Design an enzyme around this catalytic site. Structure first.
Site, mmCIF file in Angstrom:
data_model
loop_
_atom_site.group_PDB
_atom_site.id
_atom_site.type_symbol
_atom_site.label_atom_id
_atom_site.label_comp_id
_atom_site.label_asym_id
_atom_site.label_seq_id
_atom_site.Cartn_x
_atom_site.Cartn_y
_atom_site.Cartn_z
ATOM 1 N N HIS A 21 0.798 -1.215 0.000
ATOM 2 C CA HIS A 21 0.000 0.000 0.000
ATOM 3 C C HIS A 21 0.834 1.271 0.000
ATOM 4 O O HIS A 21 0.260 2.363 0.011
ATOM 5 C CB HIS A 21 -0.963 -0.004 1.188
ATOM 6 C CG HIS A 21 -2.010 -1.070 1.102
ATOM 7 N ND1 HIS A 21 -2.826 -1.403 2.161
ATOM 8 C CD2 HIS A 21 -2.369 -1.881 0.080
ATOM 9 C CE1 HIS A 21 -3.647 -2.370 1.794
ATOM 10 N NE2 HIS A 21 -3.388 -2.682 0.537
ATOM 11 N N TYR A 49 20.726 -5.437 -3.542
ATOM 12 C CA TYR A 49 20.958 -6.839 -3.890
ATOM 13 C C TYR A 49 22.443 -7.159 -3.951
ATOM 14 O O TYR A 49 22.859 -8.268 -3.593
ATOM 15 C CB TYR A 49 20.264 -7.222 -5.199
ATOM 16 C CG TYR A 49 18.854 -7.745 -4.985
ATOM 17 C CD1 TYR A 49 18.623 -9.057 -4.565
ATOM 18 C CD2 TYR A 49 17.756 -6.919 -5.182
ATOM 19 C CE1 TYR A 49 17.329 -9.537 -4.361
ATOM 20 C CE2 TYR A 49 16.458 -7.388 -4.981
ATOM 21 C CZ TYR A 49 16.252 -8.697 -4.580
ATOM 22 O OH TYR A 49 14.964 -9.139 -4.386
ATOM 23 N N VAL A 127 12.841 -12.615 2.989
ATOM 24 C CA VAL A 127 12.079 -11.406 2.693
ATOM 25 C C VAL A 127 12.250 -10.997 1.233
ATOM 26 O O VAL A 127 11.274 -10.640 0.565
ATOM 27 C CB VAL A 127 12.438 -10.280 3.683
ATOM 28 C CG1 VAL A 127 11.844 -8.948 3.256
ATOM 29 C CG2 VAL A 127 11.934 -10.636 5.091
ATOM 30 N N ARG A 128 13.473 -11.095 0.696
ATOM 31 C CA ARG A 128 13.678 -10.703 -0.698
ATOM 32 C C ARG A 128 13.304 -11.813 -1.674
ATOM 33 O O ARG A 128 12.446 -11.619 -2.544
ATOM 34 C CB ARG A 128 15.106 -10.207 -0.954
ATOM 35 C CG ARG A 128 15.425 -8.804 -0.426
ATOM 36 C CD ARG A 128 14.384 -7.733 -0.798
ATOM 37 N NE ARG A 128 13.953 -7.839 -2.192
ATOM 38 C CZ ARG A 128 12.990 -7.101 -2.737
ATOM 39 N NH1 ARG A 128 12.404 -6.123 -2.061
ATOM 40 N NH2 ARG A 128 12.610 -7.346 -3.989
ATOM 41 N N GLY A 131 9.680 -13.366 -1.763
ATOM 42 C CA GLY A 131 8.852 -12.348 -2.382
ATOM 43 C C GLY A 131 9.062 -12.256 -3.880
ATOM 44 O O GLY A 131 8.098 -12.165 -4.644
ATOM 45 N N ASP A 132 10.326 -12.290 -4.322
ATOM 46 C CA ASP A 132 10.614 -12.231 -5.752
ATOM 47 C C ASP A 132 9.970 -13.399 -6.482
ATOM 48 O O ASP A 132 9.356 -13.221 -7.542
ATOM 49 C CB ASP A 132 12.117 -12.267 -6.004
ATOM 50 C CG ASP A 132 12.849 -11.053 -5.479
ATOM 51 O OD1 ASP A 132 12.231 -9.983 -5.320
ATOM 52 O OD2 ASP A 132 14.083 -11.174 -5.257
ATOM 53 N N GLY A 136 7.016 -11.951 -9.048
ATOM 54 C CA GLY A 136 7.715 -11.529 -10.252
ATOM 55 C C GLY A 136 6.831 -11.498 -11.480
ATOM 56 O O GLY A 136 6.863 -10.535 -12.257
#
Ligand code: COH
Ligand code: CL
Length: 210
Positions: A21, A49, A127-128, A131-132, A136
């Site tokens: 959000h 990254y 977390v990265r 999620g990716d 994606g």
């Protein structure tokens, strides 16, 4: 007992909602910005990254959670390939600078790297990368549809080496459940996952602020 993966998803659910959000990400995904704002986002992602993957490398080299730390997940080099296309030049590497949020995130990742803090690294990895793997396809399609970005410059969002994404995500969650952690390590990991979402939210905040 629900498994570490389920605890992580529950613990970070509110932070995930707040990130979705955020004004910058909402505007970007809805088509209200443009390819320039998308490229600025990818540049900041390349910075964090790169640092994250130095930390992953150090933790993997220490022998911690080796099978979770799949090098195919690495995003820094593909982000650089995308950015070489988006910017029509490799010179963005010598023009970009970390936003204040990225400075803070990189500082945390470098401490995790230097300390070879396995549980903290796993939190940032979850977390990265999970999620990716989860977002994606939908995010890439939004950038293509709204801003005309060609898929050749959306490699960050694609894991061509992963034949069945859902199978991989389920296996990844099971690897999280399978980690052997002391009570201190587990609580440290869960706390760091919350911190990791905060770092990422602030990257979006900085992009929205200019
Ligand atoms: C396209 C919208 C969108 C945005 C902006 C977004 C922003 C972010 C963001 C930015 C700060 C981070 C760090 C994450 C990180 C995650 N996302 Co998303 N995600 C998004 C779409 C999704 C979708 C779809 C899923 C799978 C369903 C779910 O769990 O929500 C998802 C799941 C995840 C998961 C896996 C939960 C689990 O199964 O345990 C992580 C971790 N994420 N996400
Ligand atoms: Cl890479």
């Amino acid at each position: 007992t629900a498994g570490l993966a389920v605890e992580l998803k529950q613990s970070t659910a509110q932070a995930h909602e707040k990130a979705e959000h955020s004004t910058f990400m909402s505007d970007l995904l809805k088509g209200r910005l443009g390819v320039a704002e998308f490229t600025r986002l990818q540049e900041q992602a390349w910075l964090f990254y790169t640092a994250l993957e130095q930390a992953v490398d150090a933790v993997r080299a220490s022998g911690f959670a080796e099978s979770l730390l799949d090098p195919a997940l690495n995003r820094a080099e593909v982000l650089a390939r995308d950015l070489d296309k988006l910017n029509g030049s490799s010179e963005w590497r010598s023009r970009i600078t970390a936003s204040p949020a990225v400075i803070d995130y990189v500082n945390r990742l470098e401490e995790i790297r230097d300390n070879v803090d396995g549980p903290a690294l796993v939190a940032h990895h979850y977390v990265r990368y999970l999620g990716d793997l989860s977002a994606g396809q939908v995010i890439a399609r939004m950038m293509q549809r709204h801003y005309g970005v060609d898929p050749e410059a959306l490699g960050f969002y694609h894991f061509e080496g992963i034949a069945k994404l859902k199978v991989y995500k389920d296996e990844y969650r099971e690897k999280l459940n399978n980690l052997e952690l002391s009570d201190e390590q587990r609580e440290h990991l869960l706390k760091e996952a919350t911190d990791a979402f905060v770092f990422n939210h602030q990257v979006f905040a900085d992009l929205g602020k200019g």
